[PDB]
Design a binder for this molecule. Structure first.
Ligand SMILES: O=C(Nc1ccc(C(=O)N[C@@H]2c3cccc(O)c3C[C@@H]2C(=O)O)cc1)NC1CC1
Length: 167
């Protein structure tokens, strides 16, 4: 049993809710919150901008030190950093950004990072300002992630359509 409340069971291991990932993280304090990161860990907008703002920019400060030491991530890759006031850890995962012309096939590799964690609070990878189809992202999630994932969806109208179109 875990403390994720009001989620909708989609499969054995994937659950979904119309909710602000910032609020879910603050309420649940999950072991892992997933950030929709880019390879430079520049948390300017979308989920990343919102999570970083909620940490009062501490996420960005930590991220800048990480990049200065290690260099950029790979598209499809990830790193584990602090969850600050949101979670124990933040798993920064880089889905392909279609608005930058990146290969959508890398979306499955991006979701494979979730399998290294037994339970996660997460956004749909490559959705929103990343420019991929959220219905496609949900399908790849369900077909790739085997650990227990709680997906928070900011947009109410998108949530309604993700539920009604899910196979
Ligand atoms: O600012 C915040 N939260 C905050 C939460 C999510 C987002 C965000 O970018 N959502 C995206 C969106 C929007 C529309 C369609 C989409 O496919 C997507 C994908 C993605 C998502 O839903 O995962 C931005 C901000 N909270 C402060 C306290 C009030």
């Amino acid at each position: 049993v875990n403390s994720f409340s009001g989620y909708l069971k989609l499969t054995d291991n994937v659950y979904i809710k119309n909710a602000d990932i910032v609020e879910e993280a603050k309420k649940v304090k999950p072991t892992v919150v997933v950030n929709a990161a880019n390879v430079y860990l520049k948390h300017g907008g979308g989920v990343a901008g919102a999570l970083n703002k909620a940490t009062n920019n501490a996420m960005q400060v930590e991220s800048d030190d990480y990049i200065a030491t290690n260099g950029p991530l790979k598209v499809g890759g990830s790193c584990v950093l602090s969850g600050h006031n949101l979670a124990k850890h933040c798993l920064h995962v880089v889905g392909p950004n279609v608005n930058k012309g990146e290969d959508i096939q890398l979306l499955k590799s991006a979701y494979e990072n979730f399998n290294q964690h037994e339970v996660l609070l997460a956004p749909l990878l490559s959705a929103g300002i990343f420019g991929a189809d959220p219905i496609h992202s949900l399908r790849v999630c369900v077909d790739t992630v085997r650990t227990n994932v709680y997906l928070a969806v900011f947009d109410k109208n998108l949530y309604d359509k993700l539920v009604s179109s899910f196979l």
